[PDB]
């Protein structure tokens, strides 16, 4: 029973057992408000590894306390976070899943109390706070925080790191001309608006030589913002800097009313894959095994990412295999229930 | 929810109530072996019209008796066939379906007793018979038989006509260099191997002014054969000759093995639609309403063709509406059962 | 996996190929308003025989014009009706299905113009017309119409006859104390209210030796009306008179609605089956193969009746076999679609 | 639609939020071979509590080391087991589920090294070991082990206790004349063969005042073994002793090969419920919301037990609610996916 959905995939000596990925999903469940792993996370993430998902990516994890979305986020801004993340790594990997971490900074979308920072002092909307415009010292300090976060992730035992450059947060605010009005070398041209992302990538590669992903918002959905043609030259540069895969999302940069439907972001993933010759991940209302097999076999992406479907059924790989008429290995404790 | 699957579609005066098409499927049910419509056909085709399919296309209907696949095929080589075909048109259109017919000739894949014909004297495999190499008289007669079929179909009251240029049958044999070895003006170059189809199209347009479809095999799956790049200039020719829509299939030219999977021929249909600027229809392992709405909304085709799924469930349009969370009109007798 | 659902069942020399029955459903499609079969019926009923239903029972067919529910009903009050009914017998049985007919009289629920009849001059509700109370001449005449209908059904070639004694129509109106207030020998005790049904059964048996069904409403859903415990002695008497199977429905006697749920009338079918030791049919929100196998294997009924599900999917037996993990014979034309 | 499946149920002061139960299932995952709770159990059981199951019952938990089925079973023979079991109770109850424990002793079906015990010295089959026939002192010691296990369950915080009297294990060996050949007061009449179970129940009630379940095998499937008529007087006695619910299974006493089908043990649950006037649990090939609602609404049982279906989909309650057209509360972290 040949499917491509259940075939392995290798990225520089890390091999995933199938093409299914659990997409990063904030849980707002750090009840002690100090960034640390709690019981909620130690059941939530291993459930999907028992369910035979090949790669589990943690929710947006803040590289400074000021870069959290909410006070109940996970964090990696302290050497004290390494012990709890290491325990989580061990509980997921015992089931044969590999594990990744999404490194985040919320920028002008931070909801935490106190000062918040951004490339330019413009609020996201009339209902949100005006941020402080970063100085050159703030830029150097934030690039160093991403480096320190990557070192701690290596020390905890993660297999993959992803940089969050999407959905209107700090790095996306530097990339889009809707939010970046700067007059120094970090603004004022397509090359200068890339510079913050390029320096974050270079700083992570100084301490991390394993698989590296970047997640992007391929369109701003605005007449004066970016579209996928602007991201084709940016993806070519990321490949030269040693990024292995682009995880292709869209929007949340500007309030916009957009039409949503099955696979509505798949064309962005295939444009980047074919025009820049780099591996890609697809995401957005992917909910069935039949659908996912078509995406992979026609070369539209290399990995399929699922978020809301794995909140409804965390053992979706069993259901997807039945739909495709194939079989997969089961946890030995569940063999009497996993009949094909 | 407004969907594209249940939106109308108009071609040169003919309006289809939705984008769903029942693909042509031989039934081998002419038990008198004279090509005439039988009781089986008068239940089989009207069942799918009650089911709310927008357009129903009859099985390959042979334009000469020598051009049948089997002795139990439907035929249109006599004025005697008009009467039984007219009754069938009337039974289908009662329910709001439009109806079309696929004119065919089997060439060297014919299984009927006696002499069979081809563009060159090469059999399909080592297990099949060797065809006679067609003379110039044979060519003009066969072109003429296609014109007579179209005239008879217009007389019977069909809405749409389709020419069968695919799956290794007679027109496909002229198109392919794997089977056409001719040294006259019907072989030896891209312009020459197109000529037979070009003439068949012109002869049909002499007697028929309604929507005209053509079905192609977009790849031979063979190192020395055709690929979709060869069919882009052919589709531009057909558009200029007044063909309205290309029905995109593939294969069955060369005895071989190929791996099939959901939507495996959709990339051929999108390449023809985009590069030759002509409407297309997609076919091949399309089974769900979720899948069909993706094809249409990402612009990969204009109509979706189903075969085996309509043998398993002839009222598939109700089930597809329910999967997409929309509603469609039901036959008034069935309103207590068709609850959305 | 062998199932009872797809095992044969023999009654008095008639063998059904499985336990699945198309329950009677009015179509309101006699557009010439003379009771004759139309093209609608000649597609509708054979579609379910192609889908492999074992027994197809026609909609309520009126034994007098006055006994029609509406002007567009099927009828059997004239020898002229035999010809069209026999065409429909031939079209259904060609596929291996057996065929039955439900003989009806609408009573005080009739909607046709002019005088309507009933045991007692009481309207069904405030909004309906008041009926004439039947004389003894009217009772004898109406019994004779049921006998003539059965003779016509034998002549047309039916395999099974069913008497409609349910859903508040004429015979149900004699059985219930809610509707029957008579003071002659047709009212005022359990034996007197049974008398009209007992006399219809004897008159049919004078002309018909094949399988005989009766459909009942086993509860009135009223504190002063009938319950299943009243029907147990009536079923013991029906067995002595030569009825072969009781088709067990409920309600529609008092003008109120009730809360329904899956299998809500199965306890009535099993109480009649076990306490009167007679074969029974179950009906009401039976929609899946898993459900149908449980009814049969636990001895709750001998045949399963489906109405609304067979309007949504007329090839349900293929889907039920896949759900149960078993295989069934397919029509030869559909073998490449009906994969198990 | 209000359903009974999602209505609450109260037993002697414990309220369950719905009627769905996770049936006991051995995991053979105590890798330290000392009966203690491990990381496997701390993810496996809370997964179904997040999935909104109302009552979770732990796998057979051995009251002595000699009563284990395998060396990898959970146990409750030491005060050192209480700490790990209490942690597991807290992790499950955090989500609104209630939690139970099944107390077991494998008798002659034990696989551990050394001596094993039974009412009589007859092996289970030719391939298994001959057990020691128990003395009166062995009987007193084993009843005391069940009491000590019940006391530790209370110390750990469980809501419900179940006694395992089924599937051929030690208490079932005393009940059945196939395995009990004793000539003293524990064998040779229906009252004498009940005596071991009756003394276990009384010893548990001395230390436990909460809800008490007993699981039975209602048939041995053997001409000289027990049938459901033997268990009607047993269930009347258990009610008098203060048992609150009978959990009704069958078989695994003698090597019969019975033919199973959906709901094949539900008629046993309904016979005990109606004849002894005691609440019952139904189990056995129950997989759909449609099926479970019929069992409850037709009064066949009070709770529905699932085993293999919750190994395939641990969030089954979400799917069953959708199938029945109702809604239920979701974990707040999952509200964006649990849409209905
Ligand atoms: C509760 C929730 C939390 C999410 N958190 C993140 C996140 O931390 N980082 C991120 O890049 N996307 C996040 N997303 C977006 C998803 O990863 C995904 O891109 C989106 O929901 C579309 O995929 P789906 O249709 O499979 O849900 C979140 C989505 C949800 C519903
Ligand atoms: C029984 C059967 C008969 C068919 N007959 C024809 C035919 O007469 N002409 C044609 O062009 N294709 C014919 N086909 C091919 C189908 O039209 C369709 O292209 C193919 O089955 C793939 O679509 P599907 O996956 O929806 O079945 C037939 C297929 C089947 C199974
Ligand atoms: C449109 C329609 C017509 C029906 N006509 C009849 C009828 O003529 N005679 C009869 O006994 N029941 C009739 N019924 C009742 C059905 O036979 C069946 O008893 C009922 O619909 C419950 O079964 P279901 O849940 O499978 O639909 C009809 C039901 C419908 C929806
Ligand atoms: C892996 C497995 C372990 C089981 N362990 C137990 C057990 O410890 N105690 C018990 O009474 N039944 C046990 N059973 C039987 C189940 O509880 C249940 O009665 C049976 O599987 C039928 O229900 P189902 O069709 O929903 O699986 C087990 C079944 C399985 C498949």
Report on this structure.
4 copies of one chain form a homotetramer. Chain A has 340 residues and is an alpha/beta fold. Chain A has one domain (9-334): Aldolase class I (TIM Barrel). Chain A is 34% helix and 15% strand. Chain A has helices spanning 39-50, 82-93, 136-156, 170-175, 190-205, 228-240, 266-276, 289-297, 308-312, 316-324, and strands spanning 9-11, 14-16, 20-22, 55-62, 98-104, 117-118, 132-133, 160-164, 212-217, 245-249, 279-282, 303-306. In chain A, the strands form 3 sheets. Chain A has an 8-stranded parallel barrel, surrounded by 5 helices. Chain A has a two-stranded antiparallel ribbon with strand order 1-2. Chain A has a two-stranded parallel ribbon with strand order 6-7. The longest helix of chain A is centred in the middle third of the chain and has 21 residues, at 136-156. The first copy, chain A, is globular. Chain A starts with 8 loop residues before the first strand and ends in a 16-residue tail after the last helix. Chains in contact: A-B, A-D, B-C, C-D. At the A-D interface, helix 1 and helix 9 of A face helix 1 and helix 9 of D. One flavin mononucleotide is lined by residues 23-26, 59-60, 102, 164, 167, 215, 249, 283-286, 306-309 of chain C. Chains A, B, C, D: One of its GO terms (molecular function) is NADPH dehydrogenase activity. Chains A, B, C, D: Keywords: Detoxification, Flavoprotein, FMN, NADP, Nucleotide-binding, Oxidoreductase. Chains A, B, C, D: It is an enzyme of class 1 (oxidoreductase). Chains A, B, C, D: Substrate binds at residues 28, 164-167. Chains A, B, C, D: InterPro entries: Aldolase_TIM, NADPH_DH_bac, OxRdtase_FMN_N, YqjM-like.
């Amino acid at each position: 029973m040949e499917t491509m959905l259940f075939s392995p995939y290798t990225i520089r000596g890390v091999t995933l057992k199938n093409r299914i990925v659990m997409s990063p999903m904030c849980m707002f469940s750090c009840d002690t408000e100090d960034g640390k792993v709690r019981n909620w996370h130690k059941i939530h993430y291993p459930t999907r590894a028992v369910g035979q998902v090949g790669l589990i990516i943690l929710e947006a994890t803040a590289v400074t306390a000021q870069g959290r979305i909410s006070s109940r986020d996970l964090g990696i801004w302290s050497d004290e976070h390494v012990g709890g993340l290491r325990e989580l790594v061990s509980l997921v990997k015992e089931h044969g899943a590999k594990i990744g971490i999404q490194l985040g900074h919320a920028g002008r979308k931070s909801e935490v109390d106190g000062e918040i920072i951004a490339p330019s002092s413009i609020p996201q909307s009339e209902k949100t706070r005006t941020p402080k415009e970063m100085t050159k010292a703030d830029i150097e300090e934030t690039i160093q925080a991403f480096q320190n976060g990557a070192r701690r992730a290596k020390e905890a035992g993660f297999d993959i790191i992803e940089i969050h450059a999407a959905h209107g947060y700090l790095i996306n605010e530097f990339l889009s001309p809707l939010s970046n009005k700067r007059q120094d070398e970090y603004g004022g041209s397509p090359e200068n608006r890339y510079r913050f992302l390029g320096e974050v990538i270079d700083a992570v590669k100084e301490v991390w030589d394993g698989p590296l992903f970047v997640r992007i918002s391929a369109s701003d959905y605005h007449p004066e913002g970016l579209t996928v043609k602007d991201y084709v030259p940016y993806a070519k540069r990321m490949k030269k800097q040693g990024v292995d895969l682009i995880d292709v999302s869209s929007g949340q940069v500007f309030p916009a009313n957009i039409s949503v439907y099955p696979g509505y972001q798949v064309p962005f993933a295939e444009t980047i894959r074919r025009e820049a010759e780099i591996a890609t991940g697809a995401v957005g209302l992917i909910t069935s095994g039949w659908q996912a097999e078509e995406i992979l076999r026609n070369g539209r992406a290399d990995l399929v990412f699922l978020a809301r479907e794995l909140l409804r059924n965390p053992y979706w790989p069993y259901a997807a295999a039945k739909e495709l008429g194939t079989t997969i290995p089961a946890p030995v404790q569940y063999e009497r229930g996993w009949r094909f």
